[PDB]
Design an enzyme around this catalytic site. Structure first.
Site, PDB file in Angstrom:
ATOM      1  N   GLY A   1       0.707  -1.132  -0.093  1.00 48.66           N
ATOM      2  CA  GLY A   1      -0.063  -0.164  -0.065  1.00 48.66           C
ATOM      3  C   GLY A   1       0.843   1.324  -0.089  1.00 48.66           C
ATOM      4  O   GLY A   1       0.524   2.256   0.573  1.00 48.66           O
TER       5      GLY A   1
ATOM      6  N   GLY B   1      -0.253   5.151  -0.704  1.00 49.80           N
ATOM      7  CA  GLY B   1      -1.278   5.676   0.110  1.00 49.80           C
ATOM      8  C   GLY B   1      -0.561   7.056   0.613  1.00 49.80           C
ATOM      9  O   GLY B   1       0.524   7.680   0.385  1.00 49.80           O
ATOM     10  N   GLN B   2      -1.293   7.635   1.512  1.00 46.43           N
ATOM     11  CA  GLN B   2      -0.988   8.841   2.324  1.00 46.43           C
ATOM     12  C   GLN B   2       0.263   8.922   2.701  1.00 46.43           C
ATOM     13  O   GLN B   2       1.305   9.844   2.556  1.00 46.43           O
ATOM     14  CB  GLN B   2      -1.825   9.355   3.224  1.00 46.43           C
ATOM     15  CG  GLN B   2      -1.723  10.914   3.693  1.00 46.43           C
ATOM     16  CD  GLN B   2      -2.344  11.319   5.137  1.00 46.43           C
ATOM     17  OE1 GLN B   2      -2.370  12.425   5.449  1.00 46.43           O
ATOM     18  NE2 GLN B   2      -3.174  10.317   5.446  1.00 46.43           N
TER      19      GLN B   2
ATOM     20  N   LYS C   1      -8.662  -3.552  12.020  1.00 51.11           N
ATOM     21  CA  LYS C   1      -7.470  -2.923  12.588  1.00 51.11           C
ATOM     22  C   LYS C   1      -7.227  -3.420  14.128  1.00 51.11           C
ATOM     23  O   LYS C   1      -6.155  -3.775  14.326  1.00 51.11           O
ATOM     24  CB  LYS C   1      -7.584  -1.306  12.724  1.00 51.11           C
ATOM     25  CG  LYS C   1      -7.968  -0.648  11.466  1.00 51.11           C
ATOM     26  CD  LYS C   1      -6.847  -1.098  10.357  1.00 51.11           C
ATOM     27  CE  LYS C   1      -5.431  -0.695  10.629  1.00 51.11           C
ATOM     28  NZ  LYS C   1      -4.584  -1.106   9.246  1.00 51.11           N
TER      29      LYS C   1
ATOM     30  N   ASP D   1      -1.179  -7.431  -4.668  1.00 49.75           N
ATOM     31  CA  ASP D   1      -2.552  -7.488  -4.181  1.00 49.75           C
ATOM     32  C   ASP D   1      -2.219  -8.164  -2.948  1.00 49.75           C
ATOM     33  O   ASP D   1      -1.987  -9.569  -2.957  1.00 49.75           O
ATOM     34  CB  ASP D   1      -3.545  -8.236  -5.288  1.00 49.75           C
ATOM     35  CG  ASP D   1      -4.887  -8.254  -4.650  1.00 49.75           C
ATOM     36  OD1 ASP D   1      -5.931  -8.640  -5.201  1.00 49.75           O
ATOM     37  OD2 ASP D   1      -5.196  -7.494  -3.598  1.00 49.75           O
TER      38      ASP D   1
ATOM     39  N   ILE E   1      -1.516  -1.750  -5.523  1.00 52.56           N
ATOM     40  CA  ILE E   1      -2.418  -2.232  -6.397  1.00 52.56           C
ATOM     41  C   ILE E   1      -2.566  -1.022  -7.398  1.00 52.56           C
ATOM     42  O   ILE E   1      -3.091  -1.231  -8.529  1.00 52.56           O
ATOM     43  CB  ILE E   1      -3.807  -2.645  -6.116  1.00 52.56           C
ATOM     44  CG1 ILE E   1      -4.474  -1.745  -5.404  1.00 52.56           C
ATOM     45  CG2 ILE E   1      -3.586  -3.911  -5.220  1.00 52.56           C
ATOM     46  CD1 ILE E   1      -5.954  -2.020  -4.913  1.00 52.56           C
TER      47      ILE E   1
ATOM     48  N   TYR F   1     -13.798  -0.712   9.399  1.00 51.81           N
ATOM     49  CA  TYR F   1     -12.298  -0.471   9.541  1.00 51.81           C
ATOM     50  C   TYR F   1     -11.780  -0.573  10.676  1.00 51.81           C
ATOM     51  O   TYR F   1     -10.700  -1.432  10.926  1.00 51.81           O
ATOM     52  CB  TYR F   1     -12.260   1.184   9.054  1.00 51.81           C
ATOM     53  CG  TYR F   1     -10.956   1.460   9.228  1.00 51.81           C
ATOM     54  CD1 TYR F   1      -9.609   1.111   8.402  1.00 51.81           C
ATOM     55  CD2 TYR F   1     -10.398   2.342  10.054  1.00 51.81           C
ATOM     56  CE1 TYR F   1      -8.347   1.663   8.712  1.00 51.81           C
ATOM     57  CE2 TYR F   1      -9.313   2.927  10.200  1.00 51.81           C
ATOM     58  CZ  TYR F   1      -8.314   2.558   9.532  1.00 51.81           C
ATOM     59  OH  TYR F   1      -6.789   3.091   9.692  1.00 51.81           O
TER      60      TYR F   1
ATOM     61  N   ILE G   1      -3.788  12.231  10.300  1.00 48.86           N
ATOM     62  CA  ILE G   1      -2.304  12.757   9.913  1.00 48.86           C
ATOM     63  C   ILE G   1      -2.541  13.646   8.678  1.00 48.86           C
ATOM     64  O   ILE G   1      -3.287  13.640   7.753  1.00 48.86           O
ATOM     65  CB  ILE G   1      -1.755  11.702   9.262  1.00 48.86           C
ATOM     66  CG1 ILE G   1      -1.377  10.512  10.126  1.00 48.86           C
ATOM     67  CG2 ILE G   1      -0.302  12.011   8.794  1.00 48.86           C
ATOM     68  CD1 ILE G   1      -0.808   9.403   9.666  1.00 48.86           C
TER      69      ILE G   1
HETATM   70  N1  LIG Z   1      -5.777   7.302   6.899  1.00 51.26           N
HETATM   71  C1  LIG Z   1      -5.262   7.188   8.137  1.00 51.26           C
HETATM   72  O1  LIG Z   1      -5.554   8.555   8.830  1.00 51.26           O
HETATM   73  C2  LIG Z   1      -4.412   6.286   9.030  1.00 51.26           C
HETATM   74  C3  LIG Z   1      -4.250   6.257  10.035  1.00 51.26           C
HETATM   75  C4  LIG Z   1      -3.652   5.449  10.950  1.00 51.26           C
HETATM   76  C5  LIG Z   1      -3.560   4.282  10.265  1.00 51.26           C
HETATM   77  N2  LIG Z   1      -3.750   3.865   8.790  1.00 51.26           N
HETATM   78  C6  LIG Z   1      -3.346   2.868   8.314  1.00 51.26           C
HETATM   79  O2  LIG Z   1      -2.455   3.084   7.642  1.00 51.26           O
HETATM   80  C7  LIG Z   1      -2.499   2.154   6.297  1.00 51.26           C
HETATM   81  C8  LIG Z   1      -2.452   3.290   5.141  1.00 51.26           C
HETATM   82  O3  LIG Z   1      -2.714   4.388   5.178  1.00 51.26           O
HETATM   83  P1  LIG Z   1      -2.700   5.560   4.423  1.00 51.26           P
HETATM   84  O4  LIG Z   1      -2.819   6.944   5.195  1.00 51.26           O
HETATM   85  O5  LIG Z   1      -1.517   5.587   3.706  1.00 51.26           O
HETATM   86  O6  LIG Z   1      -4.085   5.224   3.530  1.00 51.26           O
HETATM   87  P2  LIG Z   1      -4.201   5.516   2.124  1.00 51.26           P
HETATM   88  O7  LIG Z   1      -5.966   5.476   1.668  1.00 51.26           O
HETATM   89  O8  LIG Z   1      -3.481   6.674   1.615  1.00 51.26           O
HETATM   90  O9  LIG Z   1      -3.397   4.332   1.635  1.00 51.26           O
HETATM   91  C9  LIG Z   1      -3.827   2.874   1.598  1.00 51.26           C
HETATM   92  C10 LIG Z   1      -3.307   2.079   0.308  1.00 51.26           C
HETATM   93  O10 LIG Z   1      -3.890   0.841   0.516  1.00 51.26           O
HETATM   94  C11 LIG Z   1      -3.684   0.685  -0.836  1.00 51.26           C
HETATM   95  N3  LIG Z   1      -4.624  -0.949  -1.080  1.00 51.26           N
HETATM   96  C12 LIG Z   1      -5.965  -1.099  -1.346  1.00 51.26           C
HETATM   97  N4  LIG Z   1      -6.220  -2.696  -1.500  1.00 51.26           N
HETATM   98  C13 LIG Z   1      -4.909  -2.920  -1.821  1.00 51.26           C
HETATM   99  C14 LIG Z   1      -4.620  -4.270  -2.129  1.00 51.26           C
HETATM  100  N5  LIG Z   1      -5.226  -5.167  -2.226  1.00 51.26           N
HETATM  101  N6  LIG Z   1      -3.095  -4.584  -2.101  1.00 51.26           N
HETATM  102  C15 LIG Z   1      -2.280  -3.666  -1.730  1.00 51.26           C
HETATM  103  N7  LIG Z   1      -2.795  -2.132  -1.655  1.00 51.26           N
HETATM  104  C16 LIG Z   1      -4.022  -2.049  -1.472  1.00 51.26           C
HETATM  105  C17 LIG Z   1      -4.593   1.657  -1.482  1.00 51.26           C
HETATM  106  O11 LIG Z   1      -4.209   1.413  -3.163  1.00 51.26           O
HETATM  107  C18 LIG Z   1      -3.737   2.800  -0.952  1.00 51.26           C
HETATM  108  O12 LIG Z   1      -2.382   3.204  -1.710  1.00 51.26           O
HETATM  109  C19 LIG Z   1      -3.888   1.318   6.277  1.00 51.26           C
HETATM  110  O13 LIG Z   1      -3.582   0.098   6.615  1.00 51.26           O
HETATM  111  C20 LIG Z   1      -4.734   2.056   7.586  1.00 51.26           C
HETATM  112  O14 LIG Z   1      -5.343   1.181   8.291  1.00 51.26           O
HETATM  113  C21 LIG Z   1      -4.294   4.993   8.264  1.00 51.26           C
END
Ligand SMILES: NC(=O)c1ccc[n+]([C@@H]2O[C@H](COP(=O)([O-])OP(=O)(O)OC[C@H]3O[C@@H](n4cnc5c(N)ncnc54)[C@H](O)[C@@H]3O)[C@@H](O)[C@H]2O)c1
Ligand SMILES: NC(=O)c1ccc[n+]([C@@H]2O[C@H](COP(=O)([O-])OP(=O)(O)OC[C@H]3O[C@@H](n4cnc5c(N)ncnc54)[C@H](O)[C@@H]3O)[C@@H](O)[C@H]2O)c1
Lengths: 309, 315
Positions: free
Chosen positions: A6, A9-10, A141, A47, A33, A137, A167
């Protein structure tokens, strides 16, 4: 070698080069993905719900550590819980088994304040507290935190995790997440446009700036294996504020800025979470610390958001 | 029409006849991957890890309620966590989604004290408390409670659950589980044989007698929806004792019997659990009550086990 799932993501957007800078450009491998510019760093499509793809990747790149970022967040999870469960639940299970199976030294899983529910105290909440999440969610978690701690205590797999609050960041573009209003707002502000906030005016939540978010994750990751006691579920935060507060503080810099409140289901999600966290445990065990207070993140965001708009 | 999942287990082998006597053999369907005598009640083979099989059973029998008991327990779960995760976790999700997709009005899930961990207070633990289970079984069970509560809040599916302590019974026989010593000890006692206990002599745990466990599950099933505020995770218990204590009380009835303590991995499991529970929420929200205190259960067990082992002819 480090595998980051992943990675688009952010967090992943900035964690990748952060890691490359600290550990070596070819000691890191980004995966998702959905592909994005990784500044040259090796990228592979993976994936997480497919155990087979995970094993083969761990094989070919001799993966030593894993920052598991893949998953569906709170907002999207409520729109599609079947999906959240599949990628989050099946996904993190697959990575745990794949890590245990092979020679993986460490595995870091970012957790969330989403593991909390309405029974969880609202202020100065410690890491050991009530955890009855009301979102798909949050359910997946808390399951992840427990599965990770179990694999450690059972098989010695070194999985660690901390719970991130909302964040704030500028490198990655917002994705309509529950806490993303704290990022969307800056975009409207620099354009001096009226912003429509989806969380209540006084919806207080813990938050932190991406720079500290990154350091915290790596510090957790660099901690000595035998010096961590809590190990999973470290509460981490920098400050707490309401949408109304952030607005007024941004207004001090950009007075033309306007805001209106049209709350939706995401506000119901946020209402089940605590307003502030106690992160003493993270600081006591591995010295977690913040170097960007609110004022500093506000100015920094305006600076970065304006220059790229 | 009621479908009971995992019907061949300790709870299941006695819950089926109980349910049949309350609503009629015709309105009860027993199921499991392992078939056992059900005494007239219809039995079907059903692997809960196969979502398709669930949909088919619910469709054909127009199921209106599901008592989802299928799962791998604490001890067996530790010897094969991968199996525990697959059956308990995806099996429970399968049931919930299938119940939701179809027209099942209620789903009742029996949880366990296994959801608790070292950080959980040891005495008079309330239902909403710290839940950091240290066994695969416990993690899958707390997940089940949460998934169950979510299915209600998100889709309106009426799902309820209570957490059972160790269950004592004379019909269903122990299966090398964690709290099974409380049943095993009676077989040895009645035969005047030395019982080798695998839990430490001072390992205090919450327990209850099968008849009260059955009544509690059904009382929750029939509870008024208006009073169900906690809904999932109701602590339930009757009493708390240590192995040395149960031994002494049994000894008061059969003095020519003894015991030795040779702890194994199950004591390590028990050590992460609380000693006693507070079951106030269950009593207040749906009337939970106990008919068999410690003495009545010891004496009734001695009675049934004695005739079961032919110590006192069935007459
Ligand atoms: N968003 C938040 O504020 C936050 C806070 C604390 C923890 N988290 C955790 O951190 C992780 C990611 O955070 P983020 O801020 O980068 O979120 P994000 O939404 O920016 O990124 C999540 C990523 O997961 C990917 N993804 C979805 N299905 C997938 C799959 N089958 N295989 C591979 N990748 C896949 C998405 O394409 C994306 O790039 C998550 O597991 C989430 O539970 C998020
Ligand atoms: N035994 C206890 O003391 C106790 C206490 C509290 C809660 N519970 C819960 O009650 C339920 C059953 O309890 P029990 O005492 O009867 O346990 P048990 O071990 O006697 O029975 C469990 C049943 O699950 C069945 N099963 C396993 N995999 C299956 C699958 N894929 N599909 C269908 N059935 C499958 C087994 O064959 C068995 O008949 C479990 O969900 C458990 O978590 C048990």
């Amino acid at each position: 070698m480090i595998l980051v799932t992943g990675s688009s993501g952010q967090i992943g957007t900035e964690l990748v080069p952060y890691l490359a800078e600290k550990y070596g450009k070819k000691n890191v491998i980004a995966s998702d993905i959905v592909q994005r510019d990784t500044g040259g760093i090796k990228f592979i499509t993976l994936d997480v719900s497919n155990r087979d793809e995970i094993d083969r990747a761990v094989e070919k790149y001799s993966i030593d550590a894993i920052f598991h970022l893949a998953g569906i967040l709170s907002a999207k999870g409520e729109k599609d819980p079947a999906l959240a469960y599949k990628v989050n639940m099946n996904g993190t299970y697959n990575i745990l088994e794949a890590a245990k199976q092979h020679r993986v030294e460490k595995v870091v899983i970012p957790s969330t304040i989403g593991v909390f529910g309405p029974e969880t105290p609202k202020n100065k909440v410690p890491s050991i507290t009530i955890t009855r999440p009301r979102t798909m969610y949050g359910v997946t978690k808390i399951a992840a935190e427990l599965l990770g701690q179990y694999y450690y205590e059972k098989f010695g797999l070194d999985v660690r995790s901390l719970r991130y609050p909302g964040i704030i960041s500028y490198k990655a573009e917002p994705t309509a997440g529950t806490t993303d209003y704290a990022v969307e707002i800056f975009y409207y502000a620099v354009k001096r446009e009226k912003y429509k906030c989806y969380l209540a005016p006084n919806r207080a939540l813990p938050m932190m700036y991406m720079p500290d978010a990154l350091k915290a994750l790596v510090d957790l990751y660099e901690a000595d294996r035998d010096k961590l006691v809590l190990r999973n579920g470290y509460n981490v935060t920098a400050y707490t504020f309401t949408p109304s507060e952030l607005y007024s503080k941004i207004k001090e810099r950009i007075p033309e800025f306007e805001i209106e409140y049209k709350e939706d289901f995401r506000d119901k999600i946020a209402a089940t979470w605590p307003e502030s966290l106690d992160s003493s445990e993270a600081s006591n065990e591995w010295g977690f610390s913040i170097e960007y207070d609110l004022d500093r993140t506000i100015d920094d965001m305006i600076d970065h958001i304006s220059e790229k708009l």
